[PDB]
Amino acid sequence: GTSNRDWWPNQLDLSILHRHSSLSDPMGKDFNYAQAFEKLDLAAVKRDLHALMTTSQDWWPADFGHYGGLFIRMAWHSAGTYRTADGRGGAGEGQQRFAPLNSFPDNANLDKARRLLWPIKQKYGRAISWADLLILTGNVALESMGFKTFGFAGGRADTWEPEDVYWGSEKIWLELSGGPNSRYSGDRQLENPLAAVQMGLIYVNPEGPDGNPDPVAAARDIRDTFARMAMNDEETVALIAGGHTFGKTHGAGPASNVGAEPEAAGIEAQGLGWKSAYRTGKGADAITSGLEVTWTTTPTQWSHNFFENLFGYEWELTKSPAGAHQWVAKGADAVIPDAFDPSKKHRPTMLTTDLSLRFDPAYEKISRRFHENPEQFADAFARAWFKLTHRDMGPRARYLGPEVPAEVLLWQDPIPAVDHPLIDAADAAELKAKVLASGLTVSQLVSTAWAAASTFRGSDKRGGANGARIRLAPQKDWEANQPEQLAAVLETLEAIRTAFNGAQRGGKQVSLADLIVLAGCAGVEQAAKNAGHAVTVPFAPGRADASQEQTDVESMAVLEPVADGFRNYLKGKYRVPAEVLLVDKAQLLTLSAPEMTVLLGGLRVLGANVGQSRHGVFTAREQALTNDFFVNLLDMGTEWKPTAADADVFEGRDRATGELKWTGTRVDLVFGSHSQLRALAEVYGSADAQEKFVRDFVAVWNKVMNLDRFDLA
Amino acid sequence: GTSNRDWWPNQLDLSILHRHSSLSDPMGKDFNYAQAFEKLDLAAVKRDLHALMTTSQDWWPADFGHYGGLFIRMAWHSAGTYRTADGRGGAGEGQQRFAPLNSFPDNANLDKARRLLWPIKQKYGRAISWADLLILTGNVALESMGFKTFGFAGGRADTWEPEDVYWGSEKIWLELSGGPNSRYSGDRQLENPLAAVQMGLIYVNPEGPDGNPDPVAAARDIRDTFARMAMNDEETVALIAGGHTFGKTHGAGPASNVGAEPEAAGIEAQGLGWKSAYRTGKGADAITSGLEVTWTTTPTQWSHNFFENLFGYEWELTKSPAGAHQWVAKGADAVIPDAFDPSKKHRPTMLTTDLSLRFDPAYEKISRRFHENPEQFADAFARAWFKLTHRDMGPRARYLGPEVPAEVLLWQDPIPAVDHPLIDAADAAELKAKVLASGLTVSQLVSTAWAAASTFRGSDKRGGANGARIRLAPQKDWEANQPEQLAAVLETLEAIRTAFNGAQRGGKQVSLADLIVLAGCAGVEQAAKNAGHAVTVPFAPGRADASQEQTDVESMAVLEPVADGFRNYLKGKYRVPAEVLLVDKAQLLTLSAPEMTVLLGGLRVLGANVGQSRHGVFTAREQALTNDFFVNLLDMGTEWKPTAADADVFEGRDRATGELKWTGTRVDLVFGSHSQLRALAEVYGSADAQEKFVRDFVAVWNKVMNLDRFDLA
Ligand code: HEM
């Protein structure tokens, strides 16, 4: 069946904005997962998980009689797809159970892990999501094997279809670099937003870069991919060495024995994959990665044996039974237990990427300190495990249950608690009047609030206007934010704030985070008034102001908009066309297509463009809230052509006289070109639509202002 | 970006069930198009359309000063995609304005026609849909040119995204038959459900079959495609000769001058396509099809000149200026006006497919009758034009506005008016109890109601339980409907009906159509009670009983289910896997994936399978409404293998003992295989889900019972 994608493989895809509809969700429209989880008997679920660790099933027998290592790897892979560049991937949506991640080669035999958890899932039902279950099982695995975790939060609601993530352009699983769709260029530079080295891997290749078994060069890949997953050197060494304290790899025979991944398997496989023709196909004969390495002398117990082995032996290159590159300890005795036969022992072995922890000079120093101070190792691994498994959960207000750690961590982008009465409706009216009397213009107020609120992304629930981080480094210096203009607005608003707060009694005060938002609302109200409409814009107080010391400047950098079609902004020239970047931004903002459309058309006429660009400003009454963008965009009286100087800027001329009427970018004109977007533009550009336009605009403005308001959930 | 469809091009596609979400719709949740249309000033719209017909725009000048022919072609193409096999295509959703139809080669330059209508669309806004406007425009064209139409109904609500239709498997536009993805086999047999001869055409190739200019052979393609669009010989001749009374074709120069179709064009083209480098690119220089034929001596006026020319000349094969095969009148004078130069005239010309109407012996008889009796022609054309443009609109109850024809036509599948009081809630209770006391079983009651209601398809809004056509030919003899079993049920129900109606006063009576549905309701309630659960299944009376004489048996044939996964039924062996046919059925029933899942699981355990097959009956308490299908399907204690006899039937055996527990088809086991459907099955298979399962099952049962109830809209 030939599809629209087949005919026009480069037209824009809007289906990403309409995922996760109430249509595909089996739960009712009023289901609230937080409320269900809060009633779960978490202690009961943990008991069951503890029992499961040593209840071996014959269809995938437990190594050493204990599933703990398999489960830790399942949890680490669940979390391990996370990229800081867009916040996509991670454990927070349980996406390991859907395509493509359920069939990524690095996720081989994790299908067995998840199927082992079905009886507990079934027993507790909607009160524990798959997403939370995958992480909780990893924690219980650690605890059962003697490692005290730092804590656990529930609240990851399940999702019901695949997320649309760009995992790369390669058309071959595991393709090495330099191909027609290479994710590398230059001096081993990984393309943004990717955080893994090959299609179908979590982070790096365990044999070494493109399969070359050089621990030093592997270390560079480890550092880069881990930093693109929000982890620094200390955290990276702690996580790899901590994880490889447990369990083993699987490579008992040639890989050619392993059959189709789950999404390719026959219907009789009932959702499992990688069926192996090698001997019994499981247990002692398992093939997962193709490597055959067991790290410690007690693989089912927390120990300090990883760094004792790493440093206590010299290492020789060898091959696994499947032909993969790995390392064996020179002159060692057979001290490592076999997973199934008590009469067999094995020499210590390591992966290339484990040896990175010793032969990279920066890692070596941390590794040595961990070897000499095992309590430092344990603490670091516990903290890092918590961060790994919660990094995509968003503000601490979303954390549920009795095991949430009290300690506030910097990577959580913490917001102080509010400890004073909030402003009421009369106070809001008084503050809006002050803002409008100060001389701040509609353009300035809308631009500033937009800048503050639109850093939110629903992928990891970072960003938004709570915190007033727009006043701090680095947001106050971002080019998209117009630093000089922004400074002048913030000085004015800070003076309003100070004057209001200083006149109060009874502890009442307004945050700058709330005032920025409130001021934007006043601009929208004033713009409606300019167009002859009496409109009230909803506002919810309660934001607090974070400090600079609570704002990690390096972690904030990934939130910088380098493309923001809602302000007609593009920081540089990119290979991806700007309308694709607009839809990507709309997805991160949680906007539907109708919402994106109404929002952009209104922001254009309110003066929200960076630099006051006239691109897309299709009105003679700027700063008035009208549907003029749509009416003028769709006027067949205007003909459009790309300019000679710049093919991504277009001129709109009167068709009869040739006179220049407007200019526009690709983001502006896509609304008059794409057949679905133009159908939406036509509704808002119709003669019966002015009031609809206004009311839909206020709704989506308010939505954006509230995106991070999990304190009101 | 590599997608799941790239990796697993044969996995099942569920996204067709989640189109049309509230996410993609710009109108509010409460928007009701019928209420908007009912207050449209339809007379004022028509006056504006009438003025438009002779108001030429210089960016697409009007032929002969009149856009009427262009607009008739536009309307005919909007309607002309309809296929009776699945009811897909047609004018009823305005899909001409979306991909791919907006860019079908046969739709070339209808982008200009739609653009001409934007000022009118814009003026009347949400009170006239694009879908309705396209048809209305063709009617006003006809009327302005002196043709009396049969009438017009509004009510086609706009849609906001492309429908997923299988248009064929060819990967090249207009590919000739016989290629690697040929839609023909055997002796020129077109594959179901297609109704056109080449990818990107409406019906046939105007040059002749695969370009061979033989009118006799062309006639065969015309008859077959038009029959597959629900038109017979009389209607086919009336429509082709009627349409070609007006306007002209466009082929002024070589086709290589014409550029990209709209979906491929640059963003500056603002939704238009086919831009032509030939001279002025428009008007006198237009190229659309590549043919250059003008049929009559008055192309802007209704006449009987088409048949006067067809029969009053002999015809010679020639070529257009673009090199296409066409025909010219031997020895003729230049009597046809030129479209732009009043000093030029032309000889009469014809397409190959026009000459079919004289050289096919069956068409020739009708064409001669039309020639000698042009009043017969006019009436046939007007009726056929109404049918063409309304054939996918559904029951007459959906027809809106002041020009609906009063005449009831057989093709409407008409439902008699109800002229008596309806049963009330207490009557419904009395009838349910009588049904249950008669000895009819849950299985019989469920199966019969299912059979009656599930003929509905949302593609053309035909079928459903209204009418009680299950008791008539041909439904009563369809194999899926289990004719002998069905006859026994209907006799019992008819006795109940007769007794209840004979005891009433005041004219109150119950239809058999209502009673069939009510009796199914009683079966579902009794199945719930069998499982220990008291529920009331909603029921809405007001169906009426149609007669045999009001039922076209040949038109009803396309509604026969040859595949119905909800009854585990496949009439024969098909190339398309059965799970794909289940999702197709679910789409036609308007079901989401969750709805499909719950419904199937419940039908399995109620005894709804055809023939009482045990396939998928994963319960030891058949006729009790439980979630046993899901609990048993998902139990990892059971291992599944295809049988030796039949690779599409699977045995579920105890994993430890080998004992046979169940048998299943592909339709049953896809719910334990596909990663999205398994996620759904897991919710209903959970230990907390019994209440949920029952409530969702009752809800989707009731939805199916009401699919054709546009009297309650
Ligand atoms: C450079 C990063 C890493 C690389 C290249 C890597 C590589 C791998 C490979 C190849 C296996 C074998 C899979 C198989 O054949 O069964 C594996 C196993 C495992 N990894 Fe890692 N790993 C990395 C980081 C992590 C991290 C951060 C953790 C957890 C904190 C982790 C925990 C585990 C555990 C517990 C196992 C054993 C699984 C079993 O017992 O079944 N590893 N690792």
Ligand code: HEM
């Ligand atoms: C065998 C069936 C048919 C064939 C192969 C066919 C073919 C065509 C072609 C090739 C053109 C010229 C396109 C262009 O170059 O502009 C066209 C024009 C047109 N056809 Fe048909 N047609 C068929 C049936 C119909 C039917 C059923 C109607 C309406 C009742 C219709 C009404 C029109 C009109 C009015 C035009 C003139 C358009 C203009 O003036 O711009 N045709 N036909």
Ligand SMILES: [Cl-]
């Ligand atoms: Cl994701």
Ligand SMILES: [Cl-]
């Ligand atoms: Cl359709």
Ligand code: NA
């Ligand atoms: Na994420």
Ligand code: NA
């Ligand atoms: Na249809």
